[PDB]
Amino acid sequence: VPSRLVKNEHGSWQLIVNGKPFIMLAGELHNSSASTTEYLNSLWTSLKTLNLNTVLAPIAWEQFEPQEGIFDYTLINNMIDGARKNGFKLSILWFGSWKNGESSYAPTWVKEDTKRFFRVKSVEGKEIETISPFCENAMKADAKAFKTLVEHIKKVDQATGTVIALQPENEVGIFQGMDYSKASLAAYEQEVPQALIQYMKKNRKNLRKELLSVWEENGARTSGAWKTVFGDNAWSKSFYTTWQYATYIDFISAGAKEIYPLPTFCNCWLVQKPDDMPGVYPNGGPVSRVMDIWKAAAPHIDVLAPDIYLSDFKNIVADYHRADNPLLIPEAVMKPANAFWAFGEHSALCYSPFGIEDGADNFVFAQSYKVLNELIPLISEHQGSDRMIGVMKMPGESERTVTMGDYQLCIKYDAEDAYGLIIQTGKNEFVVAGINFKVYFTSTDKKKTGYIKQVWEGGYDTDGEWKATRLLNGDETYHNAVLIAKGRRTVWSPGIYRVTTYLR
Amino acid sequence: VPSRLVKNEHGSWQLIVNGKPFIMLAGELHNSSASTTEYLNSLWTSLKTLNLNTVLAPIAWEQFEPQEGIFDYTLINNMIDGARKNGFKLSILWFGSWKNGESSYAPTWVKEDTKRFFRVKSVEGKEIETISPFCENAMKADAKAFKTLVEHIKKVDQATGTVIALQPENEVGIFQGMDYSKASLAAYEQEVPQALIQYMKKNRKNLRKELLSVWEENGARTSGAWKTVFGDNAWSKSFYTTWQYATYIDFISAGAKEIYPLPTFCNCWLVQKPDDMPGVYPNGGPVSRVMDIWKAAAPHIDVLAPDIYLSDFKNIVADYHRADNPLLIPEAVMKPANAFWAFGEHSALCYSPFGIEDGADNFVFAQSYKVLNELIPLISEHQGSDRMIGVMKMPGESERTVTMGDYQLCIKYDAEDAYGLIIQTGKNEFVVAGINFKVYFTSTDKKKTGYIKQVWEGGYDTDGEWKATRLLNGDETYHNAVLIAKGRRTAVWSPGIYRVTTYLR
Amino acid sequence: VPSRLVKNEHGSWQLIVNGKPFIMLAGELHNSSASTTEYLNSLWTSLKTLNLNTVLAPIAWEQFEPQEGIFDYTLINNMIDGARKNGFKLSILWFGSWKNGESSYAPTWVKEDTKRFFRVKSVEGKEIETISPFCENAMKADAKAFKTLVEHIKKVDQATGTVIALQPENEVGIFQGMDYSKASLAAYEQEVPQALIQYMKKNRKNLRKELLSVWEENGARTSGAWKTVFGDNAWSKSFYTTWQYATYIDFISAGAKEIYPLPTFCNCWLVQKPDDMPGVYPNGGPVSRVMDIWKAAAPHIDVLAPDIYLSDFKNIVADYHRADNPLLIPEAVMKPANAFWAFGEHSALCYSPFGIEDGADNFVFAQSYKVLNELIPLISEHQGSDRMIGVMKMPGESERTVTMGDYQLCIKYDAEDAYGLIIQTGKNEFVVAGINFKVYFTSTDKKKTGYIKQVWEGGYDTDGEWKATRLLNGDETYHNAVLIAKGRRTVWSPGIYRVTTYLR
Amino acid sequence: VPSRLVKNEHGSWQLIVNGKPFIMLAGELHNSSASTTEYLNSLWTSLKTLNLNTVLAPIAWEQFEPQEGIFDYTLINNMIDGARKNGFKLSILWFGSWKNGESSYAPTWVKEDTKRFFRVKSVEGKEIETISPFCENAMKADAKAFKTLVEHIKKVDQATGTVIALQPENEVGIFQGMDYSKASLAAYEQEVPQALIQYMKKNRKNLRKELLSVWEENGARTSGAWKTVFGDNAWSKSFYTTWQYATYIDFISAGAKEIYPLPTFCNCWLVQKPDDMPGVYPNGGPVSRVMDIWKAAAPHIDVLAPDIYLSDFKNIVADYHRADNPLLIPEAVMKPANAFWAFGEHSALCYSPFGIEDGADNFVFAQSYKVLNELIPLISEHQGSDRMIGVMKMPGESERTVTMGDYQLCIKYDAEDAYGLIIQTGKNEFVVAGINFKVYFTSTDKKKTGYIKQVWEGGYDTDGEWKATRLLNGDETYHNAVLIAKGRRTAVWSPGIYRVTTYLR
Ligand SMILES: CO[C@@H]1O[C@H](CO)[C@H](O)[C@H](O)[C@H]1O
Ligand SMILES: CO[C@@H]1O[C@H](CO)[C@H](O)[C@H](O)[C@H]1O
């Protein structure tokens, strides 16, 4: 296959594409934006101005399988064609059974057969516009459509590998404590799957404290029905709902993996506020609180990916990034600092603003992606090392201090909007990328004096070669007292600086 | 003739032009804008940017017959020529005896002979710059010129049918309780015409209350003079005055109908405020109050057409639209909402901003006519049906609910400027056009659940074929919970067209 | 001669240029703008945008005769060349002995010899930078150079007639009660010239009150010395000073008139405020108060021309326009209303904003001159008749009524900037030009009703033929209740309207 | 050599370049702007828009000698090439041992050997990022590199003379009362050099009060150690530190002078506030207070050059301009007034805004340089004479009166931004350049009346010939009552040039 996840020396998962480490400098289209060839083709030139390397775009089951057994390849065909013509990779979004909790993208022949494909019921007994995750018939229909899609992708793309990742469904779950369908209620009375029990026992010291505390509160039992093992409460309800989602979607993914395995991720509508109970957000989705349940249930799903529109970016990304879960953000705000923090601090696979086609005039973002592209080789090389960090000022922070081998780095912010990344490339050498901050280098060991030796501003050409534009000294470095990450000038955007240091 | 009104199966009057249903997406020029070939010709390109299909433009008697029996075809010729070259149909306004009550467009030779063509007199006795509607000499001279104009149009236009309608005179009436000319004072004493009596008897249940009440108050008599049948008051004065105008102009139209019958309408300066008495507005004009009088008196006038510049649009158009009177608005404000309301709610024949050449920079208006043009086939097919409605928010309204077959539609407004139309094209299919509203779809039968099935955005190509630009879903329909008529986007927004399918479960 | 003043049938003086009535739609250059060929030549395209037919431009003695007996024809020749090439007539301003009272344009060799060309002396005995009008040497040297200039103009322009008028000196006079030079003091003691006395006797009825009153206060004597005849005061001082200036300058003009007679005018710095005594303004210059002295002393000067920069435009022009003195305004503000008033109300020969080259972006002014040009034939034909008026609103006015044959015209203003002119061209026909006013037509005879019959908007083409652009009616004339002079549209400027009227 | 300092008849030092007097209408690049060929080459077109005749740009030892004995001529070669292609002369800044006090441009191989190239030590005893001026190894290595640079310049530029001046180091000195290195402390105990005693003896009447008063307070001794001759205090510490810097840098210049002598200047960071003690500003630098020490110690340095960023411009330039020290300003604000004052009042060799490449859209400054270029021959001819003054208004001044032979010039300002220069070219002739002032000419001798005779506005063509654009008179001169220096117009305004003839009567 031409896209794969491989763990490196530092234990970081890396995307390897056409043989090389690859980071998704991405954007996701608006939902409806891949729904005709003409609309989508109107967007490519805009997207190129933002220096994307990857576009996240949906295929909708309703359009792909408009009658059961009849498949329409027009949209996937034209999407791959356009991506190729414009220099983009694709992550394909599969709007099948569920998109933002609901089943609005299910085919007309699925919506109209509520007997074959039964709906979630509310606590009031109302059927809603959401297929039950307890509907086996819907699992199989969706699984067959998705497998057919991926078979086709293999058939037209196995060599070029334009398509580098798959997202089955979109923000799954219910806005309810549980499904009140008959199958849902019976499933709630069933034995906890041993797969979950075994996973927990094994990974206890590492479990989410949301799972652990409920399990332990009820005696950390290794058998029994859901209400025995996890109590009769909102949490046991969320846990068997999430199991069911993860199990249904795993089946969908397995069918594809069997024929053409690509990096596969499921995305979540975040727990918006800390007190929110399951059902305020989609109950069933891969939010961090149930990461363990998803991992135990869905081994054919590679990454649980947060959709981040909230300002608390640093805490959110640390919450979702685990040793078994690389940071992959398929939906975010169009804020360059977020990208630098994800890639630099957490070795992210993907950063993707939602509704990217709308932000074509965002020069600073475009230039930021340009700088990140220059740095992909160096970022890739240091993924997972303690020699790479992000830089992003949040309100009310004034400075950050870190150790890097022989040196202490004191990062001070010159504006609210200050961001970048720092890589130690050598005992006495650093690459600093970004804008509106300064870095002071001193000696860890206080029996020595550490100082900047020399600073060059530059960038990497299309060959990947470093080309210095200036040797920054004098006013530009306060006589080598400090690195000033002023940025590249046209308006200001992130710059790249090579700093050599010395001890004496 | 290449233009005619035909009633369809729902009872609605349609304009058939060159053998196809036609709706006037119109504009009327300022009054003096067709007075030379050069000035008119300077406007065509401006008008084209507005996506007009029809231009309303005057021929003035003073220019058409500058000396008695001498006719100048220069202006009508070049008007037709320009419309053809720029893709417009024409409705011709005839500024003859009267324009805005007065006779400023009568030929020099008519103005100068106050013996042959006597004037209205005021209550203090002064002759005003208005030819009396009791002056038979004026009626015949006007009729002969109008007839001469229409013969010419036939002669140069019978095969092409650039000209699709005629408006004899413009906003007729006097700013007086009555004319005080000796001939007027005599007329008022005369017997009420049996045509009026018989009309009232036969059409009683549909009569205006302003006429029925006065008739009824004076004993609903079936003979007698004006003052006997209608009392001695301002209303009987308005009635015999209105009868007079309708009679005079009917003759002018009939001469034209005899040789080249075109759809013909007369237009009114509205009763401007609800208490206004005849004379505050032109007394004699076809305001809704005297609609039955005009109908009884002028069978050669097809349509009485309101000139709407007031903000109370919905009430006004509902007042003028009757079984026997299609909605045709030759003068209006340049407001896209108004057009959508007239065409969608009332199946109108015409919507026409006055002074249209001034609005060439109104992109939202332009794109509104663009969308309406795409919809003419569909509008025309649903005229008079309960399966077509307008949408237009007015201040202080928040939402409208209607039933369409198996579905309830709740229309909710997302801004003050919200307008469009809705057409049910199938048991489970709707076309919704417009901007700044939302439509919630539910089952009429409470035992079932109705939902949106699928939503497409698009438009009709030049071949008249539907082309979807998107399948709107997810964010764009709140996951099929609602239709969002956000509009077509250039940001600036103008009306969009959405095809919505629904289902029951 | 290609230019001459000729009294028409109504007693109005007209300029006949190349055998046709001509009206100067003029502007005057800044003082230093014709001092080189290059600087003047840079202006002509600007001037053309303003639709001038005439430029007022100086020739400076200092440059024309830089050494005595040596004449430099460069500036005059290039000026005429440029005018011809750009479609302009010229009125030549002679900056000789005096310009704004002073002698700053006298040649170096005149300035440097205060023995030969003695200066004015102040009451304190200081010699000022003004040559004395009692210095005959200066008079003869000025006259000789001026004659040399006009002779040259004849030799290069007699057939073409680019030059249509001359202005000897500029705003002459002293900022003193009298000149205190020896010659001035002796001149004051002398007998009143018999030419003055006889002028006053013959024209007594029509004399300026300012001259009559002083004469009559002292016995209306027909002989005696200046202080005998006019008493010992500021006025007698002003009179003999004014007599001196007009005599000196009459000699200069006479020399030119002898070989090549052109319409000749002297311009004044106005009495700025009503109380102002002679010498607050240049004492000697042709202000209206001393118009009779100038007329008596200077028959070779055709017109006395006010320079009008003050806002009391209408009273000022009325004060200068007399039966023996056509209105000619060589210096003014760039206000189109003033032009329309001068030409329409007072049959003026010339309207000329000062510093015209500054005004090249004045669209409204330029279009005003376009309209006046279209109107020149019609204006010409009605000069001095009671069938032509101007229209100009001043603050605090709002309507003018006038009678014209059978009709009363009520002119009502729709804005503060309201101006134009009205010509009755027939018993029942009028041409109205202008902007921001309305005209109501009624019958003078109350037994009749007068009304507008028909209105056309239009203009005159380059052949002088009327071309209508619209028949205005309906909204555009309130159904013939009124003529609306709305203007030509692009921003609005004066329009031209033909109105027929009728009586019933 | 194609660039030389030479004293004229009025005792003024002039720069003679390619046989002709030359004034630097200059600008200095940002520090890092000459660090690659690509970055510098991106600037030339911009620099041309400002009408510079000279660029000040650095060469950095760290790049010129990247390893000891290995020399990289890329940057100097490219700089000379670009200067030639764009019509500029160069003054080369040597960022060697010190730049703004510190050793940040010293080679990596100098930085890393603190044994061979020992550092300044603080009073606390810390070694700082500054090479001690008491380090002979450092002096020798800097000297060797500097000579290599200049030998190369000779080798590629001896005929053309693009390079017209040299600045060794940049704003040298320590932010300390003294260096606490062992060498420094022991040099403080040494005998005052006789070269300094002798200078102070010979030049006593012309000494800086700052040096003289301290010498005299300790008994004006002609022998002893620093603390003997100058006391034990901050000043004797400043004196010997300054001696050391000037001595070190003189050695550096001498090596260049011996193979290819060019006008050489050292620049100083100014005493920023009058109370400031040595060390607040760089202690060692050629500030005016220690001008005598620098002259005595460094005969191979031609000029001491102030870097002027402060608003008190007139006082500062007067402070630095002495008979033995022409005014040369390598670093200044981009203010045209400062240029006119420097060149006009003080016959300056050079005016140079710092960060010049940032200033490319400064039209008025570009036009001022255009006018100064036009005037260079006339400025050159009157350098040092009392027939040439500058004009510059400072806040809270309103007029300046000067005597010029037979006339008195009253200069009155019409705006806050009023500047230029005045030359008497003849007994009765002046050239006035500038903007926003007026000049009144009267007679010195009150028994005569002096007046303007004629005024011409104009300029000098590419051949150096005067061409009048106007004879100014009437309103333009208030009838020759005054010269109005209105400026050249474009309305945006910049300096004009006016020729005024006067006369006495
Ligand atoms: C309507 O979109 C959804 O909004 C939610 C908050 O209400 C979350 O942000 C989800 O990620 C997003 O897909
Ligand atoms: C002056 O125009 C007229 O104005 C009236 C109100 O005054 C009505 O609006 C008429 O319809 C309109 O034609």
Residue numbers in the entry:
A (entry chain B), C (entry chain A): 20 to 509, 537 to 550
B (entry chain D), D (entry chain C): 20 to 509, 536 to 550
Paper quotes:
In this study, we identify a β-galactosidase with novel substrate specificity from Bacteroides xylanisolvens, an intestinal bacterium. The gene encoding the Bxy_22780 protein in the GH35 family is a component of a gene cluster containing SusC-like and SusD-like proteins. In this study, we found that Bxy_22780 specifically hydrolyzes β-1,2-galactooligosaccharides. We propose β-1,2-galactooligosaccharide galactohydrolase as a systematic name and β-1,2-galactosidase as an accepted name for Bxy_22780.
To learn more about the binding modes of the natural substrates determined above, the ligand-free enzyme structure of the E350G mutant and the complex structures of the WT enzyme with galactose and methyl β-galactopyranoside (MeβGal) were determined at resolutions of 1.91, 1.86, and 1.94 Å, respectively. In the WT-MeβGal complex, the electron density of MeβGal was clearly observed only at subsite +1. MeβGal is firmly recognized by Bxy_22780. In MeβGal, the 2- and 3-hydroxy groups form hydrogen bonds with Asn119 and Glu190, and its 3- and 4-hydroxy groups form water-mediated hydrogen bonds with the main chain atoms in Leu289, Gln291, Asp326, and Tyr328. The indole ring of Trp288 hydrophobically interacts with the six-membered ring in MeβGal. The 2-hydroxy group of MeβGal is oriented toward subsite −1 and is located close to an anomeric hydroxy group in the superimposed galactose molecule at subsite −1. Moreover, Glu190, a putative acid/base residue, interacts with the 2-hydroxy group of MeβGal. The methyl group in MeβGal faces the solvent, which is consistent with the result that Bxy_22780 acts on β-1,2-Gal3. Thus, the complex structure suggests that orientations of 2-, 3-, and 4-hydroxy groups and the orientation of the pyranose ring determine the substrate specificity of Bxy_22780.
